[PDB]
């Protein structure tokens with residue numbers, strides 16, 4: 008039932024508190040996801056443990072984010088530098104332009120024109136670690152409990168409307184200009200008010216290649232419970248990884264989903280993914296099942 | 301009875317791209333080379349700041365994908381997209397980083413703004429192809445490419461470089477490529493939708509039409525007038541059956557199999 012908000016990782020547990028304040032007050036799902044994410048972007052303690060702080064291999068912090076409302080309105084930004092609140096900029100792309108995605112310079116120029124301010128997002132430690140990783144430049148992207156940077160959040164409000172948001176600076180030491188799943192509708196996020204929503208975390212390339220969240224939602228449309236849909240999407244990714252001659256231990260993909268009745272579910276390739284669910288009973292960290300036994 | 305090889309592409313000028321793909325396919329070549337060469341032909345207006353930025357993506361028979369968006373100074377984006385897929389651990393590069401990669405792979409940096417495109421942009425200030433193929437081995441691939449920024453905001457990205465929007469290929473199901481307003485293809489994840497419908501037992505024709513019909517319903521729920529929204533798809537399955545459908549009339553597509561290259565007009569929803 009409802010309202011209910013679900014989100015990826017510890018960062019999501021934190022974002023959930025603000026999201027829930029909006030939701031419990033009868034607020035719009037879209038404000039609640041924007042407001043929950045902004046709570047973590049703006050929390051200096053979260054930033055200080057690395058939130059939104061990963062640099063690409065050129066030492067540049069570049070952010071991917073998108074947001075989706077209950078009526079297929081979307082906004083997204085990819086490879087955006089110097090702006091701390093990318094979800095809000097994505098919301099502006101949605102609301103203030105006839106486009107759905109800006110990237111690079113253009114996404115920053117647009118942010119600046121909407122009143123957002125340039126700041127340095129690169130902490131000294133991250134800079135230091137970057138300088139150190141550059142000695143060998145061995146790109147080994149990892150996504151787990153100790154290494155992640157995503158808030159994917161999906162919520163059903165009091166009116167029975169869905170919305171969602173996804174955002175990251177991951178992956179650290181990506182090639183400059185690299186875009187993950189986080190800003191791509193149907194990869195890192197998809198919301199259809201008639202069926203359900205889903206968001207994701209893990210190796211973005213794999214999410215993008217399988218159009219993961221769209222698949223999850225289409226599986227809810229085809230009769231699956233949210234959990235079953237996440238499981239089947241993950242099982243699709245597992246087959247594809249194998250057909251590709253790759254080793255599944257190198258790949259983490261986690262999905263969470265919400266249907267229109269507020270039922271929820273979650274599944275992942277590997278153990279080492281958790282999500283946060285806040286309904287009327289409170290805010291909980293749950294760990295779903297996984298395919299790689 | 302499989303119909304292979306077969307290539308389809310969007311719009312009238314698909315006829316010509318099809319002839320380049322067919323040179324590859326008629327010799328038993330890979331779908332992947334066929335679509336690449338095909339949309340290269342199309343490659344051989346700027347954004348509102350006078351900058352020519354290009355988008356492309358490519359998808360082969362085994363879920364390999366590559367994509368470039370808002371990339372400047374490189375004529376043949378589809379081939380950089382192919383380099384992304386094959387030579388990087390990533391699937392999409394944009395902006396300056398896509399260019400820096402292109403240059404490291406030996407692509408030539410060039411000026412893309414023609415004499416007359418420049419003067420038409422200054423003027424305005426004062427006032428695209430998808431291709432899918434099935435090769436002789438029975439494998440699919442797809443490519444699309446776009447170079448018209450239509451004076452949009454610097455950094456705007458349409459559907460051409462987004463997997464599941466402008467292009468999707470599943471070798472155990474089929475392939476689709478999209479036409480029409482990028483923002484609407486993106487929002488509806490159009491080509492992934494088409495292919496999952498083929499996976500739900502629709503023929504390519506039925507999947508294109510039902511995709512479009514779901515999207516008409518979405519446009520309705522958004523309070524927009526269908527006349528302002530153009531979306532369409534062409535699709536191919538593993539048996540070489542194909543189809544095509546759109547919201548509105550006036551889009552054609554080109555199809556080449558052993559019966560030859562030809563232009564066809566699909567059905568449309570807006571009557």
Ligand SMILES: N[C@@H](CC(=O)NO)C(=O)O
Pocket residue numbers: 150154155156157175176177178187188189207208209210211212
């Ligand atoms: N999906 C992100 C990585 C991630 O989930 N990080 O927690 C990416 O590919 O950029």
